[PDB]
């Protein structure tokens, strides 16, 4: 949403902070964002890549050649961008960089 | 907002509308942490010329002397928005000035604290207490033994913001007030600045003690000045600095010419002759070059015969004739001048020559025949 | 130093004993009492010990006596009227219909003057009251013949009616009024006649006046009501005290300041003014105090003492004339019923629990701090409870704020500015695709256009309706309908949904087809039925919104 | 407490009585009467009156076993008794009641003579009425009749017992059941079975109609309201094992519930707020009642006879409003000290006072809304059903109503507060035309939909 | 209906008096001077400034300019031109025995 073409205003998806099940049982009964990394070889990567799109050399293509299957990468194609938020299917929100 | 769809919400966010062609509204309206109740009508036009509004005599009693403005107000005012702007300024003012009736305490942190503090500062110590607990005084010695006390108002809340002092002593005595300061530490502060005029109480100490001061009789510790007899039917003023009381102060004379110059003279003359180092009473006896009435008629010191009005003798020739029907003022005065007083009082009227009022000082009926 | 003393305490059921039927008096030193029930006691008081109890059937409901001839009497309720000997030659007593007398039995209401005898009785539609005699003479217990009677015309039928008995000066348990007043109220000839007069007060709560010296009337003579019984204002709730007090005091005190007592707290009270006409005027009032009221009393000074359910408390009069508003304090004693005020003030009541009681109104050092210390722990403990107050008066205000915009909100839809502007939503016609098949969707979209937040309370209804026609045969799903909970629109926001209007069941879909939107609000959701509804918008979908290409 | 030598306390109408027997020598034990009353001059005690009564057997196990101001039948008059266990020791005991007057004169009023013996779920009623139990045997004894009487339903305990309006004397030991005494055999708007669990002590307040208002509190640590039978206000409690409750006034409003302990402890919780106010410990006794002369009613605290071999050493004594009591000039400030507390107390007042307009403007301004937007019945009413997993809704409807001419719908919402979340809610819409014995004629026309069930089972509950 | 009672008119009697003292044209600052000698000599030497002080600031309404519009002004503005400098003149050489608090209010006015 943050990337988004049209620039909808549409709402957050606020995924359930419980299941019917467990807000059922305990309604009867009475931080840090974790993060992760890799690195590879910028030769790899060009090597792999290359097949020259536009090119700005790497972090860029990395990122669109990742999300070649995601369909809002033809917009990051538009907006050449090493960073970005997406959400999720199932709730909370995610950073990634390159 | 500008334009009042969200404004009159904003600003009579406790009074609703009743109807839909909006015209009749009630509720209550908030001011100070109180809310008053209201019940207002307009016409089915809305103008304010004619609008029909009731409230409660709670409130009634609040605005009793403003009810002609409302009135007013109600004519003048074209919105609604406006005329309530204006009555809520108008309210907040009638409360301010009405204060002495409103009073709520945060009472744990208010009694509990103000008795621990007058505990720890000593119960000898206290002299007096406002069912309020609004006012208080105190009381300090000096090591002489001459007694000094303070008066305290208090707002609603005593740590919070700093009580107001009144202290007997003339200059403009400052003391710190943090949250952590309290009765104690402007205490050891009112200590400090005793001390500080010691001398002058000193000064004014063997002044009043070896003298026939005259007419700040029965001296409070503000006074700085002393009028002073000497000899006979004239009398000195002098007026003093406390920095330096031992210094020459500013001094003359008051009385007959001819008694004047020569003593006038004597200090033109003798004046580099000051000496701050003994008593004032040693640098002026030899200075002007006397000796001094030690109450010289304690008794009959001066019943002052000046207009009151004027305080002055000898108006255009007239006396101060016309006195005071009544033991405890006695006080003479000018027919010009009590007339042209008495005429403007409004509780004033005129016989046909004769006209009666209350004496300017005391305020019992006084009679003038022109 | 105790301003209270208990002396006695009764069988009492739960919530309460009754409003109004027991009633208490006291002679001198003797003290009679009815727990609005059968039975009637007779104490001492000095002593707190009986002295006599009286067993009767039928429960008692009023109650008088008088002095010069040591009697009592009683009404006795299905029953008529009883009368004892107060000499009187366990300590329990029953009584016989020895001493009973005119057992007319449908007879509610009655009072007495010095030698007179006055009753009102329900009959059907309209009552009547009663005139009868009473022996002055040492006879045996008698009404005599009774005098004459009328139909109370007005009032058309738990709580009794009650009777005030009114004399002017010259010449009782009732309560000698002014000349002034006499003439302000009552009109010339009872001034004239210097007859007494009678006020019934009615559980309808209108109320009505009446002259014995014009009240006689025979079988040849009847009492047509239409002149000889009058009102004097409905006071629109029942009745319960009719009293009259002293103001200005500066046993026969002739009072100016007329007491009508209602239950509600409808109080009423008329005094002379005489002023601003170069004539007689009376100074009305019509109070409003509050709650339900039980019991009334009079005090010297204009002051009087009722009960409310919750406290005892009391309002003086003594001074435009008298007063504008009716302030009120209480003295610290419960909610009480069954009073009796007597002048020395004095006076002795009853407690809901039951309990008999007289209320008599009017340096130490390292004590002095413990006494200091009582009243910080006092006042800590009032402090909570004010701070609870405030919190919940929070609560009520910002409850207030979201109704006012609420209001606002719906007289902005319902008052057309070319266009129902602050709220709009709005429904396309979007195909998808499913498991298999082109299915229909409709997208419905909500926008914010003012500044009003739709917040907590607010709910959304749409209903989709399959068709403009009704049927001979009952198909089985006339229409469909999606509710949500808008929560937190906020201004220039929006929400959006989307709907399957599509064929489910055996590849059906018609079309005039329409979608109808709705809000509703709860009332009762923030904290007869209620709730309300708004319309909000209409669309209809047809063959011109679905063709693809 | 009951021994040859013990002795109970009691209330009494602004004052306090103690029943204790004295070895009289010669004599077997008198029993002696102290009616004392509080001082207010150096808040202390004082003997205002004593009373006392002989005893004949050469027999000990004379015991008291309880008191209270009860109500005779034969006056309606509150009145004092006192119950007496007299063991002969020969497995036989007497069982006596007595009552005594303002003279401070006994009376006796049962005998009542036991083989067995009691301990008991023993309780005291109206027309000096023992009630009891040994092994599941249920039994009254009046004054009255004089003779040894059992229940007709068999019961577990009898918890609550009292006289009630138009029934005369009830008792309630089963939730379910409802008893007469005189009749043996309402039980219509009783309490959840549900809270029938867990129950253990009753005190009623008031009654309508059928209909009532009660107060109840559980085995954990709790305290309830019913009204109607609608679990309201519920608290919870400091200690454990909850003993009784009882009530006080303290003036207008200013009420509040009163719960000993079998730990010794105890609890003062104010209405209004359904929560604790004071908190008292170890607590030899307790009593409730004007014993100033105030007007409104205190409560007296007793701590503990580790201290003396005397009993009314150790009090204190707090309405928990303007009164608080128990066992270098400072003067200047006294008057303000009361002047702000009588103020803060005023204040209190008009802020009910006040709270109350702002509630009657709040409905002022909700009938006045509903008629903003503007008769007849066009309904009969609601029903509905569960099916299996399908709830259903549906309406009878009149003649005023005719489908012809207006498409009609019936929809569904939630009220949020129980389900805290956005999610849809879908009701499928069915008209149902049936004919009534056609071999006008009547024609009925309801209108009913449908949904699911188990999507808001949520919280186990809703609306 | 064209009479005003005095804006001072319900205060302390030594205030209100030196109030009608000041009024008095030039001299009238002298009579100042002699307001307080002659209290000073009365039985109530203590003469609260802090009082005084506090009635000056307080503000009340007007209604000026045009027939509508209302105004607030303290009481030291409302009161007439004369006074005011008169009272000034006064108070710069009474200086030594003012508090500060209020004098600095009263000078943002
Ligand atoms: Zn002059
Ligand atoms: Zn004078």
């Given at each position: 949403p943050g990337l988004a073409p049209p620039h909808t205003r549409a709402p957050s998806p606020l995924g359930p902070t419980r299941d019917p099940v467990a807000t059922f049982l305990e309604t009867c009964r009475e931080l840090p964002p974790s993060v992760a990394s890799i690195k590879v070889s910028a030769e790899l990567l060009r090597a792999a890549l290359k097949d020259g799109h536009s090119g700005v050399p790497l972090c860029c293509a990395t990122l669109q050649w990742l999300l070649a299957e995601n369909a809002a990468v033809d917009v990051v194609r538009a907006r050449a961008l090493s960073s970005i938020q997406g959400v999720a299917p199932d709730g909370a929100n995610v950073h990634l960089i390159v | 907002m500008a334009v009042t769809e969200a404004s009159l919400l904003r600003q009579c966010p406790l009074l609703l509308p009743q109807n839909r062609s909006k015209t009749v509204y009630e509720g209550f309206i908030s001011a100070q942490g109180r809310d008053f109740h209201l019940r207002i009508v307009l016409p089915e036009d809305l103008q304010l010329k004619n609008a029909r509004l009731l409230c409660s005599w709670q409130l009634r009693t609040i605005l009793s002397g403003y009810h002609r403005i409302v009135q007013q107000r109600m004519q003048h005012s074209p919105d609604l928005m406006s005329f309530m702007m204006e009555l809520k300024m108008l309210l907040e003012v009638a409360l301010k000035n009405r204060?002495?009736?409103?009073?709520?305490?945060?009472?744990?942190?208010?009694?509990?604290?103000?008795?621990?503090?007058?505990?720890?500062?000593?119960?000898?110590?206290?002299?007096?207490?406002?069912?309020?607990?609004?006012?208080?005084?105190?009381?300090?010695?000096?090591?002489?033994?001459?007694?000094?006390?303070?008066?305290?108002?208090?707002?609603?809340?005593?740590?919070?913001?700093?009580?107001?002092?009144?202290?007997?002593?003339?200059?403009?005595?400052?003391?710190?007030?943090?949250?952590?300061?309290?009765?104690?530490?402007?205490?050891?502060?009112?200590?400090?600045?005793?001390?500080?005029?010691?001398?002058?109480?000193?000064?004014?100490?063997?002044?009043?003690?070896?003298?026939?001061?005259?007419?700040?009789?029965?001296?409070?510790?503000?006074?700085?000045?002393?009028?002073?007899?000497?000899?006979?039917?004239?009398?000195?003023?002098?007026?003093?600095?406390?920095?330096?009381?031992?210094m020459l102060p500013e001094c003359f004379f008051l009385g007959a010419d001819h008694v004047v110059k020569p003593l006038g003279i004597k200090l033109s003359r003798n004046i580099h002759l000051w000496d701050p180092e003994n008593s004032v009473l040693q640098n002026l006896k030899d200075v002007l070059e006397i000796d001094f009435p030690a109450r010289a008629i304690l008794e009959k010191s001066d019943f002052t015969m000046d207009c009151g009005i004027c305080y002055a003798y000898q108006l255009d020739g007239t006396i101060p004739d016309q006195v005071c029907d009544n033991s405890q003022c006695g006080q003479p005065f000018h027919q010009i001048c009590l007339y042209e007083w008495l005429r403007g009082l409004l509780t004033s009227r005129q016989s046909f020559n004769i006209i009666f009022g209350e004496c300017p000082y005391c305020s019992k009926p006084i009679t003038l025949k022109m | 130093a105790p301003r209270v003393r208990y002396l006695a305490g009764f069988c009492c059921p739960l919530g309460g004993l009754a409003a109004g039927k027991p009633r208490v008096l006291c002679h001198e030193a003797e003290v009679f009492l009815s727990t609005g029930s059968e039975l009637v006691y007779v104490y001492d008081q000095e002593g707190g010990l009986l002295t006599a109890a009286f067993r009767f059937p039928d429960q008692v409901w009023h109650l008088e006596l008088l002095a010069p001839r040591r009697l009592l009497y009683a009404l006795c309720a299905r029953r008529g009227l009883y009368c004892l000997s107060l000499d009187h030659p366990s300590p329990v007593i029953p009584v016989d219909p020895d001493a009973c007398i005119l057992p007319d039995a449908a007879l509610c209401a009655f009072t007495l003057l010095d030698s007179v005898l006055v009753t009102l009785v329900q009959g059907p539609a309209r009552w009547k009251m009663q005139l009868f005699e009473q022996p002055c003479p040492g006879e045996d217990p008698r009404p005599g013949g009774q005098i004459g009677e009328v139909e109370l015309s007005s009032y058309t039928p738990h709580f009794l009616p009650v009777l005030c008995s009114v004399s002017p000066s010259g010449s009782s348990g009732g309560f000698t009024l002014e000349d002034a007043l006499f003439g302000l109220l009552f009109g010339a000839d009872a001034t004239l006649l210097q007859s007494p007069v009678v006020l019934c007060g009615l559980p309808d709560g209108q109320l009505c006046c009446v002259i014995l010296k014009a009240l006689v009337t025979s079988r040849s003579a009847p009492g047509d009501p239409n002149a000889l019984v009058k009102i004097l204002h409905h006071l629109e709730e029942p009745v319960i005290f009719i009293g009259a007090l002293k103001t200005e005091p500066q046993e026969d005190v002739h009072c100016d300041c007329l007491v009508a007592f209602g239950h509600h707290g409808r109080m009423l009270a008329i005094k002379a003014s005489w002023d601003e006409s170069g004539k007689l005027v009376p100074e009305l009032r019509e109070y409003c105090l509050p709650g339900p009221v039980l019991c009334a009393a009079c005090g010297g000074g204009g002051r009087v003492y009722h009960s409310t359910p919750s406290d005892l408390c009391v309002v003086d009069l003594s001074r435009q004339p008298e007063e504008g508003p009716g302030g009120l304090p209480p003295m610290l004693c419960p909610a009480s019923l069954n009073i009796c005020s007597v002048v020395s003030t004095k006076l002795l009541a009853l407690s809901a629990k039951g309990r008999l009681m007289t209320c008599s109104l009017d340096m130490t050092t390292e004590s002095a701090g413990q006494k200091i210390k009582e009243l910080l722990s006092g006042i800590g403990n009032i402090s909570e409870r004010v701070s609870f107050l405030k919190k919940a008066v929070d609560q009520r205000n910002k409850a207030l704020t979201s109704l006012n915009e609420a209001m606002n909100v719906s007289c902005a839809l319902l008052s057309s500015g070319t266009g129902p502007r602050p709220i709009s939503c709005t429904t396309s016609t979007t195909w998808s695709r499913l498991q298999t098949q082109d299915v229909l969707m409709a997208t419905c979209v909500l926008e914010n256009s003012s500044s009003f937040s739709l917040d907590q309370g607010w709910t959304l209804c749409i209903q989709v309706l399959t068709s403009s026609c009704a049927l001979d045969l009952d198909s089985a799903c006339s229409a469909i309908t999606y509710t949500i909970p808008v929560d937190q629109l906020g201004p220039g926001a929006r929400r959006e949904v989307t709907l399957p209007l599509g064929p489910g069941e055996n590849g059906g879909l018609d079309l005039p087809v329409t979608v109808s939107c709705t809000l509703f609000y709860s009332l009762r959701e923030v904290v007869e039925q209620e709730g309300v509804c708004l319309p909000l918008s209409r669309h209809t979908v047809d063959m011109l919104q679905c063709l693809r290409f | 407490?009951?021994?040859?030598?013990?002795?109970?306390?009691?209330?009494?109408?602004?004052?306090?009585?103690?029943?204790?027997?004295?070895?009289?020598?010669?004599?077997?034990?008198?029993?002696?009467?102290?009616?004392?009353?509080?001082?207010?001059?150096?808040?202390?005690?004082?003997?205002?009156?004593?009373?006392?009564?002989?005893?004949?057997?050469?027999?000990?196990?004379?015991?008291?076993?309880?008191?209270?101001?009860?109500?005779?039948?034969?006056?309606?008059?509150?009145?004092?008794?006192?119950?007496?266990?007299?063991?002969?020791?020969?497995?036989?005991?007497?069982?006596?009641?007595?009552?005594?007057?303002?003279?401070?004169?006994?009376?006796?009023?049962?005998?009542?003579?036991?083989?067995?013996?009691?301990?008991?779920?023993?309780?005291?009623?109206?027309?000096?009425?023992?009630?009891?139990?040994?092994?599941?045997?249920?039994?009254?004894?009046?004054?009255?009749?004089?003779?040894?009487?059992?229940?007709?339903?068999?019961?577990?305990?009898?918890?609550?017992?009292?006289?009630?309006?138009?029934?005369?004397?009830?008792?309630?030991?089963?939730?379910?059941?409802?008893?007469?005494?005189?009749?043996?055999?309402?039980?219509?708007?009783?309490?959840?079975?549900?809270?029938?669990?867990?129950?253990?002590?009753?005190?009623?307040?008031?009654?309508?109609?059928?209909?009532?208002?009660?107060?109840?509190?559980?085995?954990?640590?709790?305290?309830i309201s019913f009204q109607n039978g609608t679990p309201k206000n519920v608290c919870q409690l400091p200690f454990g094992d909850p003993c009784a409750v009882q009530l006080m006034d303290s003036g207008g409003g200013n009420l509040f519930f009163v719960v000993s302990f079998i730990s010794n402890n105890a609890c003062a919780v104010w209405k209004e707020s359904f929560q604790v106010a004071a908190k008292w410990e170890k607590l030899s006794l307790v009593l409730i009642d004007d014993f100033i002369g105030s007007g409104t009613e205190q409560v007296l605290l007793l701590f503990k006879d580790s201290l003396n071999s005397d009993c009314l050493t150790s009090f204190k004594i707090t309405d928990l409003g303007?009164?608080?009591?128990?066992?270098?000039?400072?003067?200047?400030?006294?008057?303000?000290?009361?002047?702000?507390?009588?103020?803060?107390?005023?204040?209190?007042?008009?802020?009910?006072?006040?709270?109350?307009?702002?509630?009657?403007?709040?409905?002022?301004?909700?009938?006045?809304?509903?008629?903003?937007?503007?008769?007849?019945?066009?309904?009969?009413?609601?029903?509905?059903?569960?099916?299996?997993?399908?709830?259903?809704?549906?309406?009878?409807?009149?003649?005023?109503?005719?489908?012809?001419?207006?498409?009609?719908?019936?929809?569904?919402?939630?009220?949020?507060?129980?389900?805290?979340?956005?999610?849809?809610?879908?009701?499928?819409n069915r008209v149902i035309k049936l004919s009534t014995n056609p071999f006008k004629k009547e024609c009925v026309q309801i209108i009913t939909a449908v949904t699911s069930l188990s999507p808001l089972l949520t919280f186990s509950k809703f609306c | 209906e064209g009479v005003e009672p005095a804006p001072w008119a319900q205060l302390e009697a030594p205030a209100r008096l030196l109030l009608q003292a000041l009024q008095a044209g030039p001299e009238g600052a002298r009579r100042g001077l002699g307001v307080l000698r002659a209290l000073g000599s009365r039985g109530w030497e203590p003469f609260d400034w802090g009082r005084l002080l506090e009635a000056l600031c307080r503000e009340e309404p007007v209604v000026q300019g045009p027939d509508g519009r209302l105004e607030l002004k303290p009481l030291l503005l409302r009161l007439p031109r004369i006074c005011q400098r008169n009272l000034m003149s006064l108070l710069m050489a009474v200086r030594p025995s003012l508090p500060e608090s209020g004098l600095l209010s009263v000078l943002q006015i």
């Open positions: - | 204060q002495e009736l409103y009073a709520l305490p945060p009472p744990p942190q208010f009694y509990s604290s103000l008795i621990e503090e007058i505990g720890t500062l000593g119960w000898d110590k206290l002299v007096y207490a406002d069912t309020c607990f609004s006012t208080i005084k105190l009381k300090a010695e000096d090591a002489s033994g001459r007694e000094h006390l303070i008066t305290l108002k208090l707002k609603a809340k005593y740590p919070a913001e700093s009580p107001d002092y009144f202290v007997d002593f003339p200059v403009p005595f400052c003391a710190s007030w943090t949250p952590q300061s309290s009765l104690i530490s402007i205490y050891s502060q009112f200590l400090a600045a005793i001390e500080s005029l010691k001398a002058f109480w000193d000064v004014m100490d063997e002044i009043d003690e070896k003298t026939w001061v005259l007419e700040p009789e029965k001296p409070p510790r503000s006074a700085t000045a002393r009028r002073i007899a000497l000899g006979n039917n004239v009398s000195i003023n002098i007026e003093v600095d406390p920095r330096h009381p031992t | - | 407490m009951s021994s040859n030598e013990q002795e109970r306390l009691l209330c009494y109408n602004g004052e306090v009585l103690v029943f204790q027997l004295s070895k009289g020598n010669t004599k077997t034990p008198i029993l002696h009467v102290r009616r004392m009353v509080f001082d207010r001059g150096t808040k202390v005690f004082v003997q205002k009156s004593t009373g006392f009564f002989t005893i004949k057997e050469e027999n000990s196990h004379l015991k008291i076993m309880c008191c209270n101001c009860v109500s005779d039948f034969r006056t309606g008059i509150n009145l004092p008794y006192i119950v007496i266990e007299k063991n002969k020791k020969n497995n036989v005991f007497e069982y006596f009641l007595l009552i005594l007057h303002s003279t401070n004169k006994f009376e006796m009023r049962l005998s009542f003579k036991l083989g067995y013996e009691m301990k008991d779920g023993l309780r005291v009623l109206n027309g000096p009425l023992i009630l009891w139990r040994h092994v599941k045997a249920f039994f009254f004894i009046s004054s009255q009749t004089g003779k040894v009487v059992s229940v007709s339903g068999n019961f577990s305990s009898i918890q609550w017992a009292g006289e009630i309006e138009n029934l005369g004397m009830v008792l309630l030991g089963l939730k379910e059941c409802c008893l007469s005494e005189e009749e043996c055999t309402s039980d219509i708007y009783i309490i959840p079975p549900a809270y029938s669990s867990v129950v253990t002590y009753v005190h009623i307040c008031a009654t309508e109609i059928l209909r009532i208002s009660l107060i109840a509190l559980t085995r954990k640590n709790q305290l303007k009164i608080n009591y128990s066992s270098e000039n400072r003067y200047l400030v006294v008057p303000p000290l009361e002047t702000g507390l009588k103020v803060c107390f005023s204040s209190f007042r008009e802020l009910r006072q006040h709270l109350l307009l702002k509630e009657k403007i709040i409905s002022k301004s909700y009938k006045a809304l509903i008629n903003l937007v503007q008769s007849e019945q066009l309904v009969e009413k609601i029903w509905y059903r569960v099916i299996d997993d399908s709830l259903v809704v549906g309406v009878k409807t009149t003649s005023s109503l005719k489908l012809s001419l207006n498409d009609v719908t019936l929809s569904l919402l939630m009220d949020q507060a129980h389900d805290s979340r956005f999610r849809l809610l879908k009701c499928q | -």
